[PDB]
Amino acid sequence: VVMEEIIKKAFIESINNIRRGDKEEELKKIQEKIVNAKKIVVATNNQKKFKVIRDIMLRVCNAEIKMLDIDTRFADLTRMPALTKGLIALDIEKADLYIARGRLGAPGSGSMLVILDEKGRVLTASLSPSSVIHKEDIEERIKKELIEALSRIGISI
Amino acid sequence: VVMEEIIKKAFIESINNIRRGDKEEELKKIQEKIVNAKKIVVATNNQKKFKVIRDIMLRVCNAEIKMLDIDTRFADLTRMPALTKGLIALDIEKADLYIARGRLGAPGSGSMLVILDEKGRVLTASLSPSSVIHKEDIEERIKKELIEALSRIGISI
Amino acid sequence: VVMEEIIKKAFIESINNIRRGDKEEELKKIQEKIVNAKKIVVATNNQKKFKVIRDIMLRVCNAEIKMLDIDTRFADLTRMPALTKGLIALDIEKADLYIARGRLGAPGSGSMLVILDEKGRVLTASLSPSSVIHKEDIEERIKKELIEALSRIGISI
Amino acid sequence: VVMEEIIKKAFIESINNIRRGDKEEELKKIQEKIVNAKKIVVATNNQKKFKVIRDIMLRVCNAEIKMLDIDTRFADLTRMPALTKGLIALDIEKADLYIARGRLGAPGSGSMLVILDEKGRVLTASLSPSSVIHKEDIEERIKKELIEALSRIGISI
């Protein structure tokens, strides 16, 4: 059924104080939105990071997958750069799925990879430690982030 | 040495396109804010969950630690409930540090634990799968959330 | 062209410092979005307030106009309640246009009427003082808010 | 009497449905914060725009009034540029009051002047039509915006 209807029931449950965790139908919908996506925009300009994300997502959906034409480094001026990058992509690209990776919050907070639907809803996300504290090959780090973000909502790669 | 001056310089690196990841100085400030915290507000009404968070943070700070007087279940109507709870606590309680736990994003997106400073900046966070995807005792999960949120920015428990 | 391309151009102008205020085409896009809207959701339960908003918007578009099924008073816990109400409506109802009215910001900040498109972009808005500073019949107040929000982007009813 | 405590009472009124518009005490607090402000930061680099805002605030308060070291035009990549500018200033400058002016929402949506307190709360704001809709010397526009923003919360120039 439609996402708006699934969310409506959840909002009502919360209003009437019977909300007890996520529902099965909610997780299937998130899975369905990701899986049945036809267009994905990855909010990055770095071609390496894009390859990894693209190669991964090509295994779970049959979608046209695109990189961002403009420099999103300016999202690092906002409080949560990763969401900002995703919303930037939402504003300049028509798509079913937006995947953005950048800093979590304040300088020093490390990185977030986030996945948004066509309305900018946060479907899933994953975090990584600061590179100051724990340096790692960025190809393996993104690979692990994407894997967690997908597996935590029931999609296994 | 004040946070504002460090973030400024980080913002300048992004503006002039020389920003290449987080800095050591940035990490120390975040560590300082959390470690030297004297007043902490936990944006929850669940006394169990508060107990776990309080006990953990007392191992890293000598701080007066308080729970929220009001029901934050209404935050679950927003796009990112966990963050909303923190900003609610920020709005009605004076404190050095704010810790909030709730839904990540949309229904089904699992849970987020966040730590905010006195200006609502995002210092660090952690994520967990929905109990639908992975069941777990909520006391051990929350303990795991806080420890990761602390450890990913270099704070040992 | 599509909204996504118009915004892309504007963003490019700001990044590369050729942006000098809004463009004429950008203005037409917002107007077109309001006029050709086929489904409108008013984020309220107040049927009185709904009447005024519905009747006015029927003067500018031939659209299905709907009221919110749920209580949006809990948005008043957020930093900007009116926007929150729009985003709540956006989450649980499929529509071309979302119109929300509520508190601007902090308690005392007065009221905001905001209009959002299907992706939650802010197309236009208008404000009113707290009834503390200037009392007014709420039906004329809202009618006044809506007309200005429409007139400020060049739409006369 | 402290702002967090008045907001708590307001939040409680909204939660248990006793909230009936803004209260007198709330507006006095916003007035105090603005009038008794000791440090004000204007989120701009434009000395003309800074002059007007500074000139105006000097008639209502005796405050140190400062301009931003960095260019906040990149806030135009976010969904609500004026607010983003305010939060950029909040992140990199210690102050009692933050005044930001920029675009309201999407391209074409016109301009917003907003005033934030030291925790990033929206105290008051004003809007202007796009310069496409009504041309005006920007010095008179900003002056009219600020004056509208102050009088609507009860502060006269």
Curated annotation (Swiss-Prot), chains A, B, C, D:
InterPro entries: B12-dep_deHydtase_bsu, HcgB. Signal peptide: none annotated. It comes from the Archaea. This is Uncharacterized protein MJ0488.
